[PDB]
Design a protein around this nucleic acid. Structure first.
Lengths: 61, 177, 115, 87
RNA sequence: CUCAUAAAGUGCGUCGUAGUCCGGAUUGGAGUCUGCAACUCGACUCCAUGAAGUCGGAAUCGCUAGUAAUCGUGGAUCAGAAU
């Protein structure tokens, strides 16, 4: 929820600055993200196929 | 024994606090019909043997094999086929089989319930629902082949749902709500 | 021989002889025979009168027959009286569609059937 | 002509909390406004309240309910069913 | 380190056609999971049920020595449903 995404709040609660987690930027999924892009595993793929992600290419075999 | 008090003592009491009328009408004699479980279909030329052979142990005399009235109708029926087979009699007998039936052996089955659903609705003839395996004090525990399970009825001339069943729960239990 | 809800397991091994009861099966067969101490390779016609007795009392304590089926009916009636699609699914007498089914639908049903 | 392929629509809000209550079992009935979302596993056993436009109605999610939208179990209109309303 | 148990063989026992734990279909109940989902489309199996058969109408197909019939396993394609 817009409330759960409290990560956006620079100043954390009673917890130390370590409280700040991550949260995806496109979908906002805290589950599996990718620091480098800051996007979730389900967004990095959709963004990859579209080609909106520069330098990124689908590995072949 | 415990059966005479129900026609002189526990009959006026159940007609004073919630009735206000005369003495009769509530509840007599008259024979009580005891039907048998449909023997047709189950098997072929047999069962009739083991029949009347077990229905003559709990009571006296032997059932009679009577046919219907020779009059073909809109159904598969021939002329001269033993069907029904019913025999009911009394005089003073139908009074004890209301004692050794609902006192001992019960509760003493194996998985008896206790709560019964509203049998009848706007009549007098109640209902029942017993399984195939029963344990009675007047039956051998090991020598009877093919367990039999016959229902139990009771004819009454009531006029309302209430005012009745108050006499049934006067000796025949259990019966929770 | 007689055991629970009228069962006639004749000419069979003490094992499956019980695997014919809507209540007990294979697993219950080996356990019941091991608890009562009975050979699983003996026919029902070779079983003593004392072995069957100890087999009826132990198997007696179980859930089977009508009393169980009624519980199933009630379980299908409870969700049927409510506004659950599953309950209406059991009936299937409800509209399978998108037009109405109550009336004007003989083009798919055909001649009016008896109620 | 339904369609979901691999892109189900689960309002990011009613999906983040439903997962938060998964920390240790489930949580008491919740309330959501967007019924456009679709029911899924994580929401099994929980009691989500959909907004019919006036109030929130408790909808006990079930495995058999998975796949359908919350709005499908939240009737908009209200028909008294003018009758003995039996069954 | 794991997928792996190779299946069969080898040794032993059961059985010889009685719907008998032989044969396992079908069906009821419970239940895990891959998957954002599996009512229609799943795999598997706990629990119970447990039929058709004792080599099956008119016709028709593959095969000749480690071959036929039969059983199990791996891989290519592939995020993922490969009888």
């Amino acid at each position: 929820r817009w409330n759960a995404v409290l990560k956006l709040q620079t100043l954390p609660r009673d917890s130390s600055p370590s409280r700040q987690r991550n949260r995806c930027r496109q979908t906002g999924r805290p589950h599996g993200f990718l620091r480098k892009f800051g996007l979730s595993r389900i967004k990095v793929r959709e963004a990859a196929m579209r080609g909106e992600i520069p330098g990124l290419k689908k590995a072949s075999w | 024994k415990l059966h005479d008090y129900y026609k002189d003592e526990v009959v006026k009491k159940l007609m004073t606090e919630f009735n206000y009328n005369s003495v009769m009408q509530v509840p007599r004699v008259e024979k009580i019909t005891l039907n048998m479980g449909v023997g047709e279909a189950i098997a072929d030329k047999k069962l009739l043997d083991n029949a009347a052979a077990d229905l003559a142990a709990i009571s006296g005399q032997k059932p009679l094999i009577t046919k219907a009235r020779k009059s073909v109708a809109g159904f598969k029926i021939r002329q001269g086929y033993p069907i029904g087979c019913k025999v009911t009699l009394r005089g003073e007998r139908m009074w004890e089989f209301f004692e050794r039936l609902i006192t001992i052996a019960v509760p003493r089955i194996r998985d008896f319930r206790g709560l019964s659903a509203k049998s009848f609705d706007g009549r007098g003839n109640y209902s029942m629902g017993v399984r195939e395996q029963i344990i009675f004090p007047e039956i051998d525990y090991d020598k009877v082949d093919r367990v039999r399970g016959l229902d139990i009825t009771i004819t009454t001339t009531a006029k309302s749902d209430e005012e009745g069943r108050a006499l049934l729960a006067a000796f025949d239990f259990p019966f929770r709500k | 021989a007689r055991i629970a809800g009228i069962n006639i397991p004749d000419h069979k091994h003490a094992v499956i002889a019980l695997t014919s009861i809507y209540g007990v099966g294979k697993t219950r067969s080996k356990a019941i025979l091991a608890a009562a101490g009975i050979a699983e390779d003996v026919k029902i016609s070779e079983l003593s009168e004392g072995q069957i007795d100890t087999l009826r009392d132990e198997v007696a304590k179980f859930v089977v027959e009508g009393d169980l089926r009624r519980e199933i009916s009630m379980s299908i009636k409870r969700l049927m009286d409510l506004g659950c699609y599953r309950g209406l699914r059991h009936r299937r007498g409800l509209p399978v569609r998108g037009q109405r089914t109550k009336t004007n639908a003989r083009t798919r049903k055909g001649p009016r059937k008896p109620i | 002509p339904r369609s979901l392929k691999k892109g189900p629509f689960i309002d990011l809000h009613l999906l983040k909390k439903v997962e938060k209550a998964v920390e240790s079992g489930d949580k008491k009935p919740l309330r959501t406004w967007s019924r456009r979302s679709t029911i899924f596993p994580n929401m099994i056993g929980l009691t989500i309240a959909v907004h019919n436009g006036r109030q929130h109605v408790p909808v006990f999610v079930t495995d058999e309910m998975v796949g359908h939208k919350l709005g499908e179990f939240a009737p908009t209109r209200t028909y008294r069913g003018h009758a003995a309303d039996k069954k």
